[PDB]
Design a protein around this ligand. Structure first.
Ligand SMILES: Cc1nc2c(ccn2Cc2ccc(F)c(F)c2)c(-c2ccc3c(c2C)CCCO3)c1[C@H](OC(C)(C)C)C(=O)O
Ligand SMILES: Cc1nc2c(ccn2Cc2ccc(F)c(F)c2)c(-c2ccc3c(c2C)CCCO3)c1[C@H](OC(C)(C)C)C(=O)O
Ligand SMILES: C[As](C)(=O)[O-]
Ligand SMILES: C[As](C)(=O)[O-]
Ligand SMILES: C[As](C)(=O)[O-]
Ligand SMILES: C[As](C)(=O)[O-]
Lengths: 148, 148
């Protein structure tokens, strides 16, 4: 489904990186957030939902979607709650692979910037433009355009 | 051209809103930034360029693209410098109209949130999904997919 995104946080240098993966394409949106809080996740979801047609959110940590602020963002944006991760052999290992690739790229470009957030955005850019043939960026735009 | 974006800052409640308009579609990306600085504009451009294929940036304030940090972001992302705004009757008034519409929507939803940044993201969501027929969100994905 083109409306499914998986959101997870990863920790690096005492900072938190919120990583959203568009499951059907492997496209990533990421932000360095001041703390792993419900208010940060809610704000991130409102931004994401205004940029792409988000129908469902998945995660490897269900408790991060329990706060009143996150429930309010999903209610307002019309995003449906997902219990666990439904078995889908087509997307098996895709989210883990995209997160592994992003982490590797961050490590590879880290010394090119002072701030971790700068290295993270360089890594998102490299990841989204990398041809695998099409790139994740080309794939998401094709998937969504064809779904419209 | 599908690679042209116009970036400008607007001021509201003592805060700064950086508004990026995809000129061919009217699609918007916006963020509330802590101050009108070169480092904030540079970071915003790196994020934008990793999400969409940005070729050229326009603005109504040329001096905001003179810092070493902004020049570095454009160099790394391969974004070309534009002197003034070239005459294009097809896009006449589009950026001004999109900014006017965003400002009106912010005013309309402002009392639904505590934080201005929340109202801004609600406004971006409403703007991008509004059918004018297609929405700006549907138009950008069609323009970029067809350009690929
Ligand atoms: C924090 C920061 N400063 C930057 C720069 C560029 C110039 N300067 C000024 C400067 C002057 C003298 C130095 F000795 C020095 F080390 C840096 C980028 C920057 C901006 C864009 C960019 C890159 C860099 C390094 C790398 C490739 C992708 O695009 C930075 C940068 O921080 C912001 C993006 C927030 C401005 C950083 O983290 O280093
Ligand atoms: C700051 C903030 N808090 C929120 C909420 C929701 C619950 N709460 C807790 C709360 C509890 C008791 C209250 F009396 C009270 F006023 C708010 C949103 C929020 C989150 C998402 C959202 C909306 C709201 C209001 C409006 C529609 C779009 O989606 C907020 C919100 O701030 C963050 C998004 C940063 C969490 C805000 O600015 O109000
Ligand atoms: C998504 As984690 C908080
Ligand atoms: C809470 As979310 C879907
Ligand atoms: C774009 As204004 C600083
Ligand atoms: C400096 As920018 C193009």
């Amino acid at each position: 489904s083109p409306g499914i995104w998986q959101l997870d946080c990863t920790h690096l240098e005492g900072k938190v990186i919120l990583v959203a993966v568009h499951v059907a394409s492997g496209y990533i949106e990421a932000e360095v957030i001041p703390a792993e809080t419900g208010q940060e996740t809610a704000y991130f979801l409102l931004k994401l939902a205004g940029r792409w047609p988000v129908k469902t959110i998945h995660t490897d940590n269900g408790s991060n979607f329990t706060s009143a602020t996150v429930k309010a963002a999903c209610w307002w944006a019309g995003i449906k709650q997902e219990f666990g991760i439904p078995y889908n052999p087509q997307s098996q290992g895709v989210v883990e692979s995209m997160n592994k690739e992003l982490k590797k790229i961050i490590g590879q470009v880290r010394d090119q910037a002072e701030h971790l957030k700068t290295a993270v955005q360089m890594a998102v850019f490299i990841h989204n433009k990398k041809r695998k043939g099409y790139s994740a960026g080309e794939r998401i735009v094709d998937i969504i355009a064809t779904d419209i």
